[PDB]
Amino acid sequence: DQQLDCALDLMRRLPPQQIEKNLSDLIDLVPSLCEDLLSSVDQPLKIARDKVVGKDYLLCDYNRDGDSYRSPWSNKYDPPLEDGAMPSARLRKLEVEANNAFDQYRDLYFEGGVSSVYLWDLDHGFAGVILIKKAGDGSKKIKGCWDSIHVVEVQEKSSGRTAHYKLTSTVMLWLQTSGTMNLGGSLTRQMEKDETVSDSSPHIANIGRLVEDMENKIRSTLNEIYFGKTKDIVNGLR
């Protein structure tokens, strides 16, 4: 009834530092909510090795089937799976292109880190997740990490000359060191827009521009909230 609501609200309050443990304990508390919780609660991104191509890729609920995850490079599951969820032949071609575009995007903005893009078919369009993970180098005795999770939905139209894009974007930003000091968590923003779909403005360029606009905005809001607002709140305690 109100259980799913209460669970999501509860994850907005429990310390983000223990997201993975708290989500698993939450699902044990209410097992009937497992599927909705795994697809709705953002979790820190994990890195896996695709041994066939010798490339790292990122794990999340969107590339999971059972206990296996799908590589965007080889399009195979690890551990192997015979009955695994797959993009349609045509969408997979678009997924390969998207991975190569956002790998360049990643290099341009993050100058390192790892990226992965997974697409899936919908009845009148498609959806995708764009993932970026970049760890801090540990300088100045501070450990950092940045996780981007961009979920986009594309609703295609009759003209083929216009589509409706819906973007839900989360950045998880993790910082920790006198004594102990841990400043972490995430921000989520949404936006939706119509865009022209053309030979000169294809889906991936439209998505790319929406993600870049959104992530530039979120980087600036993270700066404001983390290092402005929460510091201000601390100083208002004393």
Binding site: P31, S40, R64, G66, D67, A85, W120, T168, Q190, E192
Partner: peptide, 17 residues
């Protein structure tokens, strides 16, 4: 707000399934 797109019905993790 609005909802994220949902994915096809897939196998749950071995623990809860």
């Amino acid at each position: 707000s609005f909802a994220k797109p949902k994915m096809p019905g897939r196998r749950l993790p071995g623990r809860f399934n």
